[PDB]
Write an enzyme that holds these catalytic residues in place. Structure first.
Site, mmCIF file in Angstrom:
data_model
loop_
_atom_site.group_PDB
_atom_site.id
_atom_site.type_symbol
_atom_site.label_atom_id
_atom_site.label_comp_id
_atom_site.label_asym_id
_atom_site.label_seq_id
_atom_site.Cartn_x
_atom_site.Cartn_y
_atom_site.Cartn_z
ATOM 1 N N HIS A 60 0.967 -1.215 -0.121
ATOM 2 C CA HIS A 60 0.042 0.042 0.019
ATOM 3 C C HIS A 60 0.621 1.252 0.096
ATOM 4 O O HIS A 60 2.080 1.124 0.470
ATOM 5 C CB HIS A 60 -0.998 0.168 0.969
ATOM 6 C CG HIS A 60 -0.472 0.338 2.457
ATOM 7 N ND1 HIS A 60 0.061 -0.719 3.272
ATOM 8 C CD2 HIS A 60 -0.105 1.382 3.019
ATOM 9 C CE1 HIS A 60 0.624 -0.147 4.553
ATOM 10 N NE2 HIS A 60 0.409 1.081 4.287
ATOM 11 N N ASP A 168 6.770 2.038 6.330
ATOM 12 C CA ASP A 168 5.352 1.494 6.341
ATOM 13 C C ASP A 168 4.483 2.172 5.544
ATOM 14 O O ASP A 168 3.882 3.039 6.055
ATOM 15 C CB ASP A 168 4.812 1.041 7.765
ATOM 16 C CG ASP A 168 3.577 0.199 7.515
ATOM 17 O OD1 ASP A 168 3.131 -0.293 6.516
ATOM 18 O OD2 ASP A 168 3.046 0.010 8.949
ATOM 19 N N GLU A 197 -8.000 1.125 3.182
ATOM 20 C CA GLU A 197 -9.505 1.818 3.363
ATOM 21 C C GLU A 197 -9.322 2.406 4.714
ATOM 22 O O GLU A 197 -8.891 1.325 5.717
ATOM 23 C CB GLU A 197 -10.425 0.563 3.326
ATOM 24 C CG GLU A 197 -9.886 -0.689 2.919
ATOM 25 N N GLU A 198 -10.050 3.488 4.771
ATOM 26 C CA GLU A 198 -10.164 4.098 6.278
ATOM 27 C C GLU A 198 -10.979 3.290 7.079
ATOM 28 O O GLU A 198 -11.951 2.464 6.642
ATOM 29 C CB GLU A 198 -11.043 5.369 6.305
ATOM 30 C CG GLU A 198 -10.910 6.214 7.414
ATOM 31 C CD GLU A 198 -11.498 7.819 7.235
ATOM 32 O OE1 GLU A 198 -12.429 7.903 6.259
ATOM 33 O OE2 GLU A 198 -11.227 8.773 8.111
ATOM 34 N N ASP A 214 4.711 -6.362 3.313
ATOM 35 C CA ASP A 214 4.382 -5.407 4.282
ATOM 36 C C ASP A 214 5.677 -5.120 5.369
ATOM 37 O O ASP A 214 6.805 -5.569 4.815
ATOM 38 C CB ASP A 214 3.259 -6.028 5.234
ATOM 39 C CG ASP A 214 1.804 -6.003 4.689
ATOM 40 O OD1 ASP A 214 1.694 -5.102 3.561
ATOM 41 O OD2 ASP A 214 0.879 -6.917 4.884
#
Lengths: 309, 308
Positions: A60, A168, A197-198, A214
């Site tokens: 992300h 991150d 996503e919030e 990650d």
């Protein structure tokens, strides 16, 4: 790979405005992808190769930060967190906004005692940001309400270690980009660069496997479950309730790592078959997140051995 | 402008793969511009003139389309949209790919019963594309996963109207190209032909050349009131800066004075902007329709305003 990491960690892209990170990824991938599309749901998808197996690698691109919520008549800004940022990481810090604007974080308190009481239980309504403006109107032209800001911290080398904001998950992005830069893929290889996503609330393409790249907490600082260490290698996640096919992915990567002497560590916690591979990181959610660059390279090795042949 | 519009609308240019559109534009502008550059994303920036005021005209070069997400064992393709393409606009159509390949869109479910309950809830995973392939191996060699396609529709005249694919926004591209072809610039005029949506152009004003829905068809959307042959559409933005409103006022006086037909389109904003739109019927279908007089009136309006 050092410059790719600098550029990615230093990019502006708080949850809400990641578009400069997408441009940096694409220009770095120029010449290494067969195509790219930004699907309906905000995702940059890139691909390379034509093998029968379709493998997705996903990191992300959004970072934690701050969003402006009010301005006062002197031009001091009220902020609230974006992502998991602690106000204790913000005292005396500088913040970068989208247009280049730099702001300084201060804390309210009429008296010496009132300020020590505020630091004992610190909250975002006792903080403010100073951008050098003198009027509500001069400040709204510089950073209006809804503006996002990020740590005004950049990449530096501490001995071997790499330190920056937003490891991150810009380091996961860098792992994917450097895989596409080096690989001759035996699979059809997708790189998916998502936005988280919030918290108050599927890929554009079908594939056979998806591997999330990650960040995992490196718990090797003072006064510290047999957890993850810098220079231990990539952390292969043992998830309870994984599928037959997910577990097969995890066993592949393990075998690859042993077969090729790639250092790794197994991380236990306290639809497309998936695995997770994480870079051990010290000081997550601070302006000086820390990684060992040999783990980053170990991770590129493992994924190139697994997906490349 | 007829051949200009035929060439631009028929060009292959889905988001990402616009080289043919870029190349045609530059070919049409040879000798009419002072320079150009293609930026990193694939925006083409051109310029003409040396006046003190700098004006960007901007249209976007990409069109809607499909992407190949899978191939099956008998060579049939699975697809996903790229842009706002409706699966009902793809029933029975030909799709053209970058290398010339043509595909036929079919829908799954042989039984006449499943066929009419698919077309009620139609979805891209009920669709496939047949490229005359007989295996994944043939098919993947003609059309690999990730290949882009566009409508296989071209330019036709329909009784004085022009019809083609991708009027949104190749018609705005032809408006910009024609302005540069004809104009003696009083400004420093930049033309920006954008990719997926600053350009490194400092600029005093910027005018978007877009498509607007022509709501003059049977049971047309009530909300819209723009019409073919009504002239270029001048967007009234409820929240325009003084300088953006100054631009709009300037365009109205040009049109009034030079007897150009025009219509008013009513509901961090740094560079002052206005929007000029070509009324278009059947946007997002293989057969988008414009009236050439709106396009010429739009070209007229811009030339009287930006030089001569």
């Amino acid at each position: 790979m050092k410059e790719l990491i600098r550029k990615l960690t230093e990019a502006f892209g708080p949850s809400g405005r990641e578009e400069e990170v997408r441009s940096i990824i694409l220009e770095e991938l120029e010449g290494h992808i067969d195509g790219h599309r930004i699907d309906g749901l905000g995702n940059l998808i890139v691909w390379k190769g034509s093998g029968e197996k379709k493998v997705i690698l996903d990191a992300h691109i959004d970072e934690i930060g701050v969003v402006v919520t009010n301005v006062d008549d002197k031009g001091f800004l009220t902020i609230e967190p974006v992502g998991g940022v602690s106000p204790y990481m913000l005292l005396g810090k500088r913040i970068r906004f989208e247009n280049g604007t730099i702001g300084v974080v201060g804390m309210e308190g009429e008296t010496t005692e009132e300020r020590q009481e505020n630091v004992r239980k610190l909250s975002f309504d006792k903080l403010f940001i100073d951008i050098g403006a003198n009027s509500r109107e001069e400040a709204q032209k510089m950073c209006p309400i809804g503006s996002f800001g990020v740590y005004d911290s950049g990449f530096v080398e501490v001995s071997g270690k790499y330190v920056s904001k937003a490891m991150d998950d810009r380091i996961g992005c860098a792992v994917i980009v450097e895989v596409f830069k080096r690989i001759k893929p035996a699979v059809t290889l997708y790189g998916v660069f998502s936005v988280q996503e919030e918290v108050g609330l599927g890929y554009g393409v079908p594939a056979d496997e998806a591997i999330a790249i990650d960040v995992t907490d490196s718990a090797d600082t003072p006064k510290a479950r047999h957890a993850m260490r810098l220079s231990g290698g990539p952390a292969l996640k043992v998830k309870d309730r994984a599928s037959i096919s997910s577990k097969r992915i995890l066993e592949n990567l393990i075998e690859i790592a042993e077969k090729f002497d790639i250092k790794y560590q197994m991380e236990v916690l306290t639809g497309i078959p998936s695995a997770t591979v994480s870079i051990p990181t010290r000081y997550v959610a601070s302006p000086s997140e820390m990684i060992a660059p040999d783990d980053v390279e170990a991770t590129v090795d493992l994924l190139i051995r697994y997906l490349g042949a």
